């Protein structure tokens, strides 16, 4: 099949496999997959369960038309009223909704809770809302238990609008992360890990860079502050420091493999950064061949102008780029044709928890779309050999994760 036929097939399968037809939100499996990936990777943020009792009544009293129409109306309201980065909005039941808000503190979660209540108020007992503030990585069983208690508390005392639970640890503000990151950038406190992405034979396609730094014997990883830098607009300050450092180790002459650097969405949106990247890569043209710039899919779909500027400047200096979280935005896959990325890193959603028939088709279709263009398909966070062999039957060619990090 040609691209447009293949891409449209991939977008159809992705919609039928992970989206609720009526609400057009994520379905039950989507919510289940999103929850497991966020909890196992960071678990920092908030999760909420909205029990739209008024939708339940319409289904039992007025029929499917009334309930369906109200589900769609509330779904569009939530989808438009809660614009939070990397948020997950899913319909986990006929009248229940699950929301995942990564990297959000209790004060921001409680604001979103009143916003979800305001959505229901605009669309005329009515609801029960349970909000859980999560600080550390835990099991999906433990978090779902906390949500179940958050709901119980909202019903136990309807003197409040929503039940709130926190588990457990006084966190850091956004400006506190900035001064903390700027200090690590000041003294070169940052440590770098290189996770290899290999083919089934062990051929290293590239190594994704992971950053961390220490203070007081406490270790902070990039995903603990990357959002605060973006929300403070200062994400370019960190991405420039990483690129500078990665160029040094490349100029030590030892690393023969390309290095993948994650570029923040808020970094490419800044014209100063795209200028800074073209000057840096011009004065380090020797090692640009070993530079892979991992662009999130959000930049291609929502900032295609700056991304085209960044991609053009990157490829005219000998470097290349790839798509990170490929397919995650549930939008058009056209940009694969217009940008022709060197690789696509499939999002966690389309690679894990493939328990249903249609999920596997979506993987093959979404992967063929890039494969049939000569674009290397990569699956990350691959933790098992049986997982690797399974993904290789669905047009995944490069693998990254625990199975690669255990070998030798
Ligand atoms: Mg990445």
In the chain the domains, ranked by start, together with CATH numbers, are 3-167 (3.30.70.270), 174-404 (3.20.20.450)
Handedness of CA 262, 265, 268, 270 (dihedral sign): negative
Query: Rounded to the nearest whole angstrom, what is the distance from the C-alpha of residue 153 to the centroid of ligand 1?
Result: 38
394 SS3 class:
coil
Q: Is 231 helix (H, G, I), strand (E, B) or coil?
A: helix
Interval between CA 307 and ligand 1 midpoint (Å): 16
Strand partners, 344: 323, 377
Helix, strand, coil percentages, rounded to 5, for the chain: 50, 20, 30
DSSP bridge pairs for 212: 191, 221
Ligand 1 center–CA 294 separation, angstroms: 6
Print burial letters for 238-254: b (CB count within 10 Å at least 16), e (below 16). Answer: bbbbbbebbbeebeeee
Q: Cα of 327 to ligand 1 centre, how many Å?
A: 14
Q: How far apart are the CA of 325 and the centre of ligand 1, in A? A: 8
Distance of alpha carbon 60 from alpha carbon 66, whole angstroms: 10
Q: Is the peptide bond before 168 cis (omega within 30 degrees of 0)?
A: yes
Q: Which distant-in-sequence residues (6+ apart) come within 8 Å of 142 by Cβ?
A: none
Token output for 9: 């097939």
Closest CA to 261 of 286, 282, 287: 287
Expressed in angstroms and rounded, the spacing between residue 346 Cα and the centre of ligand 1 is 10
Q: With CA atoms as reference, report the closest residue to 47 among 130, 120, 162.
A: 130
Instruction: State the Cα–Cα distance between residues 242 and 100, nearest whole angstrom.
Output: 29
Length of the chain: 408
Q: How far apart are the first and last CA of the chain?
A: 40
Name the residue with tokens 């992970």.
18
Name the experiment that determined this structure.
X-ray
Neighbours of ion ligand 1 (CB under 5 A): 262, 294, 324
Q: 291-296 and 398-400: which strand pairing?
A: unpaired
Q: Which of 319, 322, 333 is nearest to 377 (CA)?
A: 322
DSSP string, 13-67: HHHHHHB-TTT-SB-HHHHHHHHHHHHHHT--EEEEEEE-HHHHHHHHHT-HHHH
Are residues 246 and 221 in contact, defined by beta-carbon separation less than 8 angstroms? no
C-alpha 115 to ligand 1 mean position (Å): 31
Cβ atoms within 10 Å of 124's Cβ, excluding its own: 7
Give me the phi and psi of 206, to 5 degrees please: -160, 180
- What are the residues whose beta carbons fall under 8 Å from the beta carbon of 322, sequence distance 6 or more? 260, 292, 293, 294, 295, 341, 342, 343, 344, 345, 376, 378
Q: How far is ligand 1, taken at its centre, from the CA of residue 209, in Å? A: 8
């Amino acid at each position: 099949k040609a691209f447009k036929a293949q891409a449209k097939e991939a977008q159809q399968l992705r919609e039928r496999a992970y989206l609720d037809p009526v609400s057009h939100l994520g379905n039950r499996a989507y919510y289940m997959s999103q929850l497991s990936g966020w909890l196992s990777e960071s678990g920092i943020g908030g999760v909420a369960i909205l029990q739209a009792e008024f939708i339940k009544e319409l289904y039992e009293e007025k029929g499917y038309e009334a309930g369906d129409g109200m589900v769609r109306e509330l779904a569009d309201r939530l989808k438009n009223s809660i614009t939070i980065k990397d948020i997950s909005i899913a319909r986990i039941s006929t009248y229940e909704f699950g929301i995942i808000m990564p990297n959000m503190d209790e004060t921001e979660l409680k604001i979103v809770a009143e916003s979800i209540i305001t959505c229901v108020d605009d669309i005329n007992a009515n609801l029960s809302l349970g909000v859980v503030s999560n600080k550390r990585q835990s099991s999906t069983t433990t978090l779902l238990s906390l949500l179940d208690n958050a709901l119980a508390k909202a019903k136990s005392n309807p003197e409040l609008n929503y039940g709130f639970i926190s588990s457990d640890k006084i966190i850091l503000g956004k400006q506190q992360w900035k001064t903390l990151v700027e200090e690590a950038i000041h003294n070169d406190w940052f440590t770098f890990r290189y996770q290899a992405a290999n083919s089934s034979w062990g051929k290293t396609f590239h190594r994704e860079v992971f950053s961390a730094f220490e203070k007081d014997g406490v270790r902070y990883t990039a995903n603990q502050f990357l959002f605060a830098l973006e929300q403070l607009n200062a994400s370019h300050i960190f991405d420039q420091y990483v690129i500078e450092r990665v160029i040094q180790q490349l100029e030590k002459g030892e690393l023969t493999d390309p290095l993948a650097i994650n570029i923040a969405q808020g970094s490419i949106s800044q014209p100063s950064f795209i200028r800074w990247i073209s000057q840096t890569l011009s004065k380090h043209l020797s090692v640009a061949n070993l530079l892979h710039f991992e662009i999130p899919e959000g930049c291609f779909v929502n900032e295609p102008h700056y991304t085209a500027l960044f991609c053009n400047a990157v490829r005219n200096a000998g470097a290349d780029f790839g798509v990170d979280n490929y397919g995650r935005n549930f939008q058009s896959l056209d940009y694969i044709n217009e940008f022709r990325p060197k690789y696509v890193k499939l999002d966690y959603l389309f690679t894990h928890h493939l328990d249903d028939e249609r999920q596997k088709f979506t993987l093959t279709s979404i992967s063929r779309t890039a494969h049939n263009l000569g674009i290397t398909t990569i699956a990350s966070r691959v933790e098992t050999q049986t997982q690797l062999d399974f993904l290789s039957e669905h047009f995944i060619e490069v693998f990254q994760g625990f199975i690669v990090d255990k070998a030798a």
